[PDB]
Structures are given as structure tokens and as C-alpha cells.
Symmetry: C2
Subunit: 55 residues, 2 copies
């Protein structure tokens, strides 16, 4: 569980975009791969949340 | 993994807000509990994403 995530966790590269590849590389069910996406803010949120303010 | 999520998965009640309680109830590491939060859109996104449009 946590140990698999530590080795799987790395820089936000192309592997982060395709979480399915990581699950196959470690042969783990999408459950562990999805958690990494949830922890990585870049992989979780796509566009910006609020528009901020109008200048 | 997936089987634990099916039993853990339910309606968005108070348990969904406190994911730590669910992990203790099933004695599973925050990894499985976090995945449920990532899958449940209500638990994942807090406020609204884009402001939509200005009327
Ligand atoms: Zn990432
Ligand atoms: Zn929920």
C-alpha cells in the first residue's frame, strides 16, 4: 500500500498523465494508482478553480 | 482493494466528510479511503470550479 506508492511516486512526467500505465508497471489495481492522482494536485485539478478576479 | 471499496462506498453522508473514520472502521490505510474521496466528486471538489459567466 504505502510502500508501493513511495516507489511509484515520482516527478509529474508522462507516466502521471497515464495512471493506467503505472498500475500495469507495478501490477496494482487502479485503486493505488488513483490515490496517487488524488495526491498530486497537478494530476487532480485540470484547469484553474476560481477565475480569481476581473481586472 | 476493490471489494473493500464496494462495501465502504455508500451515500455521501457524514462518513464521507471524515474519511479517517472510514479507514478506522475498516482498519485500512488512508490509501483506500483517499481513493473513495477522489472518486466521489462531492468529496473531491470543494467549491465550484469556474465561476461560469457574469450576467
Ligand atoms: Zn502529477
Ligand atoms: Zn461523497
Amino acid at each position: 500500500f504505502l510502500d508501493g506508492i513511495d516507489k511509484a511516486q515520482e516527478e509529474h512526467e508522462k507516466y502521471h498523465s497515464n495512471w493506467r500505465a503505472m498500475a500495469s508497471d507495478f501490477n496494482l489495481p487502479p485503486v493505488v494508482a488513483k490515490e496517487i492522482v488524488a495526491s498530486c494536485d497537478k494530476c487532480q485539478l485540470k484547469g484553474e478553480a476560481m477565475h480569481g478576479q476581473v481586472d
